[PDB]
Amino acid sequence: FINKRIVERVRVGQILAVLNRRFVAYKGKMRIMDITQSLKMGTKLAAPTV
Amino acid sequence: QVYMHRDMLPEPRLDDIERFRQEGFYYTNMLEAPPEIDRVVQYTYEIARL
Numbered sequence A: 001f002i003n004k005r006i007v008e009r010v011r012v013g014q015i016l017a018v019l020n021r022r023f024v025a026y027k028g029k030m031r032i033m034d035i036t037q038s039l040k041m042g043t044k045l046a047a048p049t050v
Numbered sequence B: 001q002v003y004m005h006r007d008m009l010p011e012p013r014l015d016d017i018e019r020f021r022q023e024g025f026y027y028t029n030m031l032e033a034p035p036e037i038d039r040v041v042q043y044t045y046e047i048a049r050l
Helices: B017-022 B045-049
Strands: none
Touching: none
16 A cells, blocks of 8 residues: 555546646756855955945 | 046137237146035045945
8 A cells, every 4th residue: 555646547638637837947048157166265345244 | 636527628719820829828737726625526445346
């Protein structure tokens, strides 16, 4: 006994009845970059912070 | 006492060429008197960076 729907007998009228998740995607023009390597002691920012 | 201000070079007219030649026309950037303190804006490094 599993209590999870691993294999289900479904009629072909509801093949695409599993489309219930919302997805987002960035467009092709955008770039994704990491800035964790910019944490160095010599850096000073223009606007001071508390 | 060094200031930055927008000024234009003089363009004197030639009423009589001999009379204009008689006087020693010349131009300077020397200031006879410093500008009024209520018409000057002070910049330091911090405000420029901000």
